[PDB]
């Protein structure tokens, strides 16, 4: 192989300003033949095949607005985005198309930065009609923030809870950058119905101090 | 207009096998190199086979030599993956791309999943609603991927978010999809999420009140 090392793994950029992602190379991608630099890079956004940008490391494909920019040589490349935008949220790969093994780089997630905003919290019992089938599903929403941080606490009966929980985060919204985010306490029914108070603890940039939301069952 | 299109992919035990195809329309497909590329769940892409235009010549990944087979039918337009003796590894979307130096047409991709675990199809709960008010179905204890979720047979789209699915320990996926609304609007308007799995044929529609 020759290995294709990205830099950095992920970056935020305000909208306008310039984005610069590196690659480097393990070996030479120059073809002695032809004098091209036989490395390419790709755009890939969620559910989509990756997108074509530019390749002998500098020319655009037909379609891709001048803002991207390819440079390089030898076993150094790099890919610039001037004046970024919202549509320009993706990950972002180089390849070595110069011989096989086709390698390539690990990715860069590009995200916009924007200014911190807290989250709205909210917080959802189970349904009668999942108790009835023997589990409880507790569900807590952390909506439209940033930065992607934060730290969500489960507590019942006022006691911290540990490895019966999962999170799931959204890609940054395309409105406004935010991210969304859903904490899920999963407990037996018998183990639910045993307890009172259910509370999501919510720590986060934004928050001057930690946000809770609570309900206690069958209120 | 320049077309891929890949098919075959499905759920597959560990140790079985699978034939993808890969449809070409829009250009001279015999003119050109094409290939696989797969890319496994949240990871990044990986290039696995290859074969020429006028030669034929053939590479392999050397993570997929020896199982897998590339070929081509130029009187069909086509391109095959021959998958044996799979492994839980090579879960991934797979695509199709037409190369001339660097991979310029690709498929949207096929899914192929390797595990011994059965299908199974979700079960749909609300998330009920208590200036801004939060509601949504749960979707629980399916498998494999995906589900897709639509509110309101696709008009509602604003302030919806649709979670990631995530893993369970139980080896099922779960996931959520919510929606904020103004809290004066739970008079006015009706919410229906439908969750679609295609892998188990389930088709569900839930009203979700207050």
């Known amino acids: 192989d020759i290995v294709m090392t990205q830099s950095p793994d992920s970056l935020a950029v305000s909208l306008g300003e310039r984005a610069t992602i590196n690659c480097k190379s393990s070996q030479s991608l120059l073809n002695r033949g032809n004098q091209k630099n036989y490395l390419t890079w790709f755009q890939q956004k969620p559910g989509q095949p990756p997108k074509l940008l530019i390749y002998?490391?500098?020319t655009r494909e037909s379609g891709v607005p001048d803002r991207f920019s390819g440079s390089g040589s030898g076993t150094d490349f790099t890919l610039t985005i001037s004046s970024l935008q919202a549509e320009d949220v993706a990950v972002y790969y180089c390849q070595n198309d110069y011989t096989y093994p086709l390698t390539f780089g690990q990715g860069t997630k590009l995200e916009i930065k924007r200014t911190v905003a807290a989250p709205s919290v909210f917080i959802f019992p189970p349904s009668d009609e999942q108790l009835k089938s023997g589990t409880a599903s507790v569900v807590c929403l952390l909506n439209n923030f940033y930065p992607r941080e934060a730290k969500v606490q489960w507590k019942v009966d006022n006691a911290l809870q540990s490895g019966n929980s999962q999170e799931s985060v959204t890609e940054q919204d395309s409105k406004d950058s935010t991210y969304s985010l859903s904490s899920t306490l999963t407990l037996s029914k018998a183990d639910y119905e045993k307890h009172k108070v259910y509370a999501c603890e919510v720590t986060h940039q934004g928050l001057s101090s930690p946000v809770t939301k609570s309900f206690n069952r069958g209120e | 207009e320049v077309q891929l299109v890949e098919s075959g992919g499905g759920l597959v035990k560990p140790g079985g096998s699978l034939r993808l195809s890969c449809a070409a329309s829009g250009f001279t497909f015999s003119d050109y190199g094409m290939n696989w590329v797969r890319q496994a769940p949240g990871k990044g892409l990986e290039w696995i086979a290859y074969?020429?235009?006028?030669?034929?010549?053939?590479y392999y990944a050397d993570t997929v030599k020896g199982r897998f087979t590339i070929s081509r039918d130029n009187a069909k337009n086509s391109l095959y993956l021959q998958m044996n003796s799979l492994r839980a590894e090579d879960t991934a979307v797979y695509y199709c791309?037409?190369?001339?130096?660097?991979?310029?047409?690709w498929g949207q991709g096929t899914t192929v999943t390797v595990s011994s675990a059965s299908t199974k199809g979700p079960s749909v709960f609300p998330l009920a609603p208590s200036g801004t008010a939060a509601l949504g179905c749960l979707v629980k204890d399916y498998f494999p991927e995906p589900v897709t979720v639509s509110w309101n047979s696709g008009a509602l789209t604003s302030g919806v978010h649709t979670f990631p699915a995530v893993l369970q320990s139980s080896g099922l996926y779960s996931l959520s999809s919510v929606v904020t609304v103004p809290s004066s609007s739970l008079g006015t308007q009706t919410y229906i999420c439908n969750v679609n799995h295609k892998p188990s044929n389930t088709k569900v529609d839930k009203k979700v009140e207050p």
């Open positions: 791309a037409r190369s001339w130096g660097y991979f310029d047409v």
């Open positions: 002998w490391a500098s």
């Open positions: 074969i020429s235009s006028g030669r034929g010549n053939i």
